[PDB]
Symmetry: C2
């Protein structure tokens, strides 16, 4: 069976976890610290904090900006539910904006238009666009728009560690940026994430919030404010540190497999049967998602791929369709693209241990399903 994801943990990391478990510095230590330094260096960004998961990064980003009851944040319609959920868990309201059919990312024009017509009652405080599947496209526009309207930008870069927006690493443009190390992502620590920022107060506040408001004072550990526990373990950090220096190379290989998909599938796209993703420069290809034409039933397609030894899945959800984010501004809007991607979007296997023969088999099987051969 060709699998969607096969997490790759280097043997050196496995040995290192063993050493840690046996010695027994388990809690956040020199491994987390070093992982943060290496993440910061990788990204070109002043600060990193590793945390329990990608949702925690988002959560701390909201909390550090003091976003909560009375406030509003704009989220894309197409994403994993965490993006909108985590906004509402603070008390704020998730205001949904549709995404663009080509990028699968928040539509910058709908975004600006949503801001201009905003009528409260809550105060709009941030934009939380998703760089979906590792796609950076739109990011500079989101920044430009956020500044024009005096809003914070929080990058939900869950899927985009290693993606690059022209000259600038994804995650480093927002006031803060957030990454997931969930096993479906390309660097995984099983569960894990990171919150990054160029802002010292946001960093220091998130860091207090991450660990019970603890910081170092003259006579020892001080408790300066209320907080949570969103710490990552030292052995998880070690896992991540071993993957990070391989990550760019892994991404390069993924872009090469995407080239293979694109050329093999281009005729099906020509015939109007599928829409292929635009893998722009700096796309990290965390996911390769096509869109099935209208005529097809994704459930049947997936079944027939599975019978041919190929895994597939939906790409992401439609937040409007979940019916959980019920600000009047959402119920009075109309969403077109996100709901379509939710039903017709089909992720195909693309990871570190697929080769050209695997992709040829996948595309031939797709062909035979769609064209009936």
């Amino acid at each position: 069976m060709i699998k969607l994801s096969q997490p790759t943990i280097p043997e050196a990391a496995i040995e290192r976890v063993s050493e840690i478990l046996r010695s027994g510095q388990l809690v956040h230590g020199e491994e987390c610290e070093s992982f943060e330094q290496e993440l910061a260096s990788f990204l070109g960004v002043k600060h990193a904090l590793v945390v329990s998961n990608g949702t925690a990064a988002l959560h701390l980003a909201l909390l550090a900006l003091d976003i909560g009851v009375g406030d509003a944040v704009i989220v894309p319609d197409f994403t994993f539910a965490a993006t909108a959920n985590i906004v509402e868990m603070t008390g704020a309201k998730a205001i949904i904006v549709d995404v663009d059919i080509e990028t699968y990312n928040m539509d910058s024009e709908l975004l600006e238009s949503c801001i201009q017509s905003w009528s409260g009652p809550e105060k709009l405080k941030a934009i939380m666009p998703v760089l979906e599947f590792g796609n950076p496209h739109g990011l500079k526009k989101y920044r430009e728009i956020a500044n024009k309207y005096n809003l914070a930008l929080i990058e939900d870069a869950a899927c985009a560690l290693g993606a690059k927006e022209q000259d600038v690493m994804v995650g480093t443009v927002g006031d803060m940026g957030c990454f997931s190390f969930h096993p479906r992502k390309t660097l995984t620590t099983g569960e894990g994430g990171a919150l990054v920022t160029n802002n010292d107060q946001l960093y220091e506040k998130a860091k207090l919030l991450r660990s019970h408001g603890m910081m170092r004072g003259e006579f020892g550990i001080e408790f300066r404010c209320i907080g949570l526990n969103y710490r990552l373990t030292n052995f998880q950090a070690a896992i991540g540190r071993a993957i990070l220096p391989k990550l760019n190379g892994w991404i390069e290989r993924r872009r090469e497999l995407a080239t293979i998909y694109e050329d093999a599938l281009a005729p099906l796209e020509q015939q109007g049967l599928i829409r292929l993703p635009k893998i722009v420069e700096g796309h990290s290809v965390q996911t390769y998602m096509i869109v099935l034409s209208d005529q097809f039933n994704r459930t049947e397609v997936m079944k027939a791929l599975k019978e041919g030894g190929i895994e597939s899945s939906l790409g992401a959800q439609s937040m409007s369709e979940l019916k959980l984010f019920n600000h009047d501004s959402n119920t009075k809007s109309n969403y077109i693209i996100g709901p379509k991607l939710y039903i017709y979007g089909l992720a195909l296997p693309l990871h570190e241990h697929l080769n050209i023969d695997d992709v040829n088999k996948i595309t031939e099987t797709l062909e035979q399903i769609l064209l009936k051969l």
Copy 2:
């Protein structure tokens, strides 16, 4: 150097983590499921959920009971800050009650008296007593009091997995009970925790909240409500599963070391120089904390123990002294015991790899410091 804590990870668990990392079922799986079943069986309780840490268990317990803005929860003055912090992170207010000089646990009489004189404005919804250091004493009284006043009981059993209140396992008396698997605790998963309950709706709600409101529906995974990510990894769960069948035995050995401390130190207690903890039946001895007399400076004692090759620390904090929990009801109360334990309480090494000679060395060194020999 004799150490306060030396986390014990069995070699079988280490190998199992390796297998998991290499195979790569990383996210919550059959290991978490099984760990929950074994925890439930160990405790005699209907439901367990493993979670990222002990603070997360507490958090989910609050959220599952719908505790937040407008609400109040009673917490002990002597505990780790998470207990009070996590109440306030929901929007509720932490109402502090002093603890008892012998048990280090919430004073049941001050508790009841705090309820009787409560004057809002918030609605009092719960009691969150701490079974501090693994001490069960008071637990049935907390239940009795909670029922009399129609309040939920949430056990902060962070430190008390394996402790027993007469016939009944700690954690199984509250509407919910919460455990930490932090490395200072006797079973550790590096970071980890569990939320347990005999109530099906609280279990089902916490479980939705733990993972983005996900549950199983006829055509697949459904998103039924907003939630968080508080999942534990499959490999962490494996660690915990390997420790749990050893835990009772580990506790028995700890009670035996406590016997040794008690007899070696009893003269110092006789002379009024220290107060020894009362290790009642069912105390899991997560921590052995003495209280220094007035005359002594704990900082100097700790320094001199360290120079004699012995680690020590404070036991816990005073919530009133942190000045973070500022409901009028707290600022107009007076706390006696918690503030004293905060300054005079001294934890001494007691874990799986200390022997009688280690304890004899510790108590002789203490003796020579206090009596100046």
